[PDB]
Paper text:
In 2011, [name] ([name]), a component of desmosomes carrying four extracellular domains (EC1 to EC4) has been reported to be the main receptor of HAdV of serotype 3, 7, 11, and 14. The critical entry step in the viral cycle is mediated by the adenovirus trimeric [name] and more especially by its distal globular domain called the ‘knob’. In the present study, we investigate the binding mechanism of the ARD causing agent HAdV7 to the EC23 module of [name] using biochemical and biophysical methods. We report the atomic structure of the complex solved by cryo-EM using phase-plate providing improved high-contrast images.
HAd7K in complex with EC23 resulted in two coefficients at 6.9S and 9.7S, suggesting different stoichiometries. This hypothesis was confirmed by the cryo-EM analysis in which two populations corresponding to HAd7K with two or three modules were found. Extensive 3D classifications and refinements indeed show that the complex mainly exists in two forms, i.e., a HAd7K trimer can interact with two or three EC23 modules hereafter named HAd7K-(EC23)2 and HAd7K-(EC23)3, respectively. The two models are very similar with the exception of the extra EC23 module in the HAd7K-(EC23)3 complex. The overall root mean square deviation (RMSD) between HAd7K-(EC23)2 and HAd7K-(EC23)3 (without the third EC23 module) is 0.5 Å. For the [name] domain, the main interacting residue is R316 which fits into a pocket formed by two loops at the surface of one HAd7K monomer. R316 forms putative hydrogen bonds and a salt bridge with D265 while the other HAd7K residues defining the pocket are F269 and V300.
Numbering used by the authors:
A (entry chain C), C (entry chain B), D (entry chain A): 128 to 325
B (entry chain F), E (entry chain D), F (entry chain E): 100 to 330
Write the structure that this text describes.
């Protein structure tokens, strides 16, 4: 059964499932996550789609940073009350999330052997860097720096794993103007990490 | 009367004018050679075989001619207008089954203009600028930003647009732009007591009037030009 | 059976299987494609090898763009009469394409839920960007911008899926000269997409 | 059994397993390799961690290049006496290398059909390029050019496959100073190749 | 005595001073509005609902106010000090259950300074430099490197630091830096017989006294400024 | 006669000259210290243990000496010739089983030149250029492009090569290059009636005579230098 090798938000949820900005009173964006167990690694496939107007108005500025922060317990279940994503991940049922309980979700987690908590001599191994793109209204691709940070902090004793994705741009012009701004969509970003034992 | 080789293929006029945009993708339809046959239709001479005879700036193999339909397209070699503004293209239509003989036919000229995109960022032809400003001086056009843009002199891809980045918030100055010279004439609308021994240092940002092309947007990182004006 | 999880052109076909340039009277290049079903994603692995002289002479110019455009029907079978690649894809038999019919080829296709046809509000999600390289004769790597576009248009009612790969460079010198130009080979490019249901 | 689809050095070995620099009298760094059989491809996941002081002092210079060179015999077994990595690869046992013999290790190897030995007309297909990062002490990411070279040379008749990874930077400042230099760790690098038959 | 709407919410002072670093991440805690209620605790008027009334440079939506706690944070719009050095922020505390009426309350002003990071690489305001050097000339401060840095004039992110890249190994010259003008005053500590008709060409590297920010480190690729001095 | 410690290890000459290319990869074979033993072969004193005593520009740890064979290689620290043109290397051969005593031995000097690669793009030392051209003026060498290249003054990695990018298609001008000064002397081979009040604006591209190195090719994006000449 290959549907149990994926842990992911669904393809295009009907409502926003993530609250990036703290000023937002409710969920303001759709976070698309995918985690695929490829051998001893996890292939992670992430992007965001803006829903709220104040999230979509970020394309009118030239210095933007925002952050999806995800916390997971000892079984790998998402801590939605502390995470940006407010809907728990699940397995594959076609284009949608499955419904039941999670089996071996802990194996999807970043490995604490490779990515330890609170080790100053080994902090450099917690970092992943990359680039995604924002297509403008005139089909201009603007590069976006992505910093993925694995197992950085535990907010409480419940948190056992941590994934912090940070998108940012520092551009010479705003990618859009106030009239032409429609929706902040980032091109997908694929990174890898060594996964925890099942 | 048969469909013998008895005439030359017929054009509609000797001069065809097409036009294509700079940096267009491959297989972009530039134009069409609208020809016709004076013989009977559905015949061998009606099967017109167009043929590009000559490019005058022949070195880049830019255009492609669909020999069956006469549609002229762009190729994988990308057009750059700032090295070749326009192209001239001698083509001929040929009757028969594609036999190549030295028999004369009717051949036409094609003029293809290349339409400019704003693919060049304006740069300043001057580096240090400084002016002397006194009191009861107003509407004073003392200094002018030299700029240089390569995009088709006279067009809106070439006309400089200026904004203040820092230094002028009180409203001391204001930029007009000269189009015959592409010049950032910056003015003086608020007077300074010259005796104050003050500074009015500022820095500007240079860009074209039209928005940049999608190839060079996201690559445009303007560094503010630091004009220091002493009063 | 892990040979049915790959849909791909073969490794080094004996003759050219793709016609990139429209001026070419026959196939002018070898297109190497690989599609691997990794969970709910497809890992796609593409490059080109020049065969014809007029395709290989592109390395003597500093502004190049070319495009492999692929159309697929409702079952995921390639429409060779409309696509750049003129040989249908097949499964794995060692280093070669298999011979029989395709099983669950539709699952290799980009998902119309994630990548819809003709939706102006969601067009930005159809775009993938990246970089490959061209090694010169003096072992200089020239960067090549790649734009992958998923489910953009249907030429007819037969087309149900669409993958447009576009390579381009805009360099300050020609990577080769007329004597030193041997063969246009691009470094491989790996991208991901959310796949259609099987 | 999905543990046999990975060939890899272990996660954080207790001692250094690789000798990058020739001036080193013993192993001076930990090389982390991972090879995952994804369909007809291998996903390769590599980075280095500095152990010795003379390997870690490279961060105090602005022009660095170093090379992990790996040679494999006809069965895919690593030739440790010729390779930079002095410990043979093995399968997955949790976060550690397994112990027994290798099964179908030859399938993890780069394909000699796609990547042939000593063909001048097809040398350009042996090249992979990419970028990893070095996080500085002030959390500055410095880009590192990576050149992966597949099946370039055989030192003897025993060598049947070859993977040369070369990291280098040419920066405008040294990433560290002599006091602030702690450990040279590169961000992980993922590349793909067409794999040999099993 | 009930917890009626009988007063205005109480501030500790009319002027609050906070401070935040340039290019800070989102949800960075800038400051806190320490207010109090003169009424009974655990009451409706004790539930203070803070509210940002006005930014004076209102156009970028930079700050966020936690209306329950009064903690002021940064947002996803990243701060750039070199366009706005500081911010002024009129806020008001409101009692009740969040009812919005035109009843006056006590409202305070907030001043937020933006702390500068070294996010700008210094560039030279002069391009060609050349001096004449004679014999029995020593401790001679003949030429000065113009530089320009945008990072908060007077700070160590703005003060130029100079090193020789090539040309001066004998120890002919030595750079001092003027701070009132940000000037690379390069000296002459080893004499040259001017009759020798020699050359002392060299090239320098310009950088700030403080280390560059982590955003622009790894993007700093200095090109050596080629100062040619003829003796 | 035994193989006692009775002599000093024998060199072939006191001065060894090697040579290595700039930006060479690690473990690139620079040279070899060809020494010999005056004692019996296959002996302890025959086991020569070479040892690098001193680098004179000792700060970068560039070279490695195989103490068994005497082969000198490059290390992971990459050579840059434009900071250190050559190196001097005092080494000594030692007999015995690697015992380190203060007993004198025969020690030699090694001179290693670094061979230059074209790793620097030439840049113009002048920014604005303009000349006055009259009629019956031909073969006129009125203006000269200042350039600056760092790659080993006198070499072909340093000699400027010029091409016209735009402006001169009629064949008005022609660039010669001065090698003693590295100067783009541009000429005048087609006369202009000065009374015409015309313009002959053009733009050139500067590059070295030799092709650029593979490190900086694909990073070379020339911006055309806009020389405006008024007639």
């Amino acid at each position: 059964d290959d549907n149990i090798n994926t842990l992911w938000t669904g393809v295009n949820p009907t409502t926003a499932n993530c609250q990036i900005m703290a000023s937002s009173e409710s969920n303001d964006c759709k976070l698309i996550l995918t985690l695929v167990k490829t051998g001893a690694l996890v292939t992670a496939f992430v992007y965001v789609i803006g829903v709220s107007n104040d999230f979509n108005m970020l394309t009118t500025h030239k210095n933007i940073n925002f952050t999806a922060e995800l916390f997971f317990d000892s079984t790998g279940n998402l801590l939605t009350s502390l995470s940006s994503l407010k809907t728990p991940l699940n397995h594959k049922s076609g284009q949608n999330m499955a419904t039941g309980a999670l089996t071996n979700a802990k194996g999807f987690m970043p490995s604490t052997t490779a990515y330890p908590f609170n080790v100053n001599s080994r902090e450099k191994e917690n970092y992943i860097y990359g680039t995604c793109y924002y297509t403008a209204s005139d089909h201009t691709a603007f590069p976006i720096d992505i910093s993925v940070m694995l197992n950085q902090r535990a907010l409480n004793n419940e948190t056992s794993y941590c994934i912090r994705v940070t998108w940012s741009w520092n551009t010479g012009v705003a990618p859009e103007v106030q009239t032409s701004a429609t929706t902040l969509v980032t091109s997908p970003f694929t990174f890898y990490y060594i996964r925890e034992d099942d | 009367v048969l469909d013998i080789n008895d005439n030359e293929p017929v054009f509609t006029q000797d001069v065809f004018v097409g036009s294509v945009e700079e940096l267009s993708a491959a297989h972009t339809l530039v134009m069409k050679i609208n020809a016709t046959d004076a013989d009977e239709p559905n015949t061998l001479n009606s099967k017109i075989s167009y043929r590009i005879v000559s490019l005058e700036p022949a070195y880049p193999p830019v255009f492609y001619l669909n020999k069956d339909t006469g549609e002229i397209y762009t190729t994988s070699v990308t057009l750059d207008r700032e090295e070749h503004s326009s192209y001239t293209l001698t083509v001929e239509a040929r009757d028969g089954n594609g036999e190549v003989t030295d028999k004369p036919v009717k051949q036409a000229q094609v003029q293809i203009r290349i339409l400019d995109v704003n693919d060049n960022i304006p740069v300043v032809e001057n580096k240090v600028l400084e002016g002397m400003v006194e009191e009861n001086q107003v509407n004073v056009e003392v200094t002018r930003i030299k700029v240089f843009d390569a995009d088709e002199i006279g067009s809106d891809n070439w006309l400089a647009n200026f904004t203040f980045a820092s230094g002028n918030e009180g409203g001391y100055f204001h930029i007009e732009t000269d189009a015959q010279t592409n010049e950032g004439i910056v003015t003086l609308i608020k007077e300074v007591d010259y005796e104050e021994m003050k500074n009015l240092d500022f820095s500007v940002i240079v860009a074209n009037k039209a928005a940049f092309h999608k190839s060079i947007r996201s690559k445009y990182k303007p560094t503010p030009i630091p004009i220091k004006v002493k009063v």
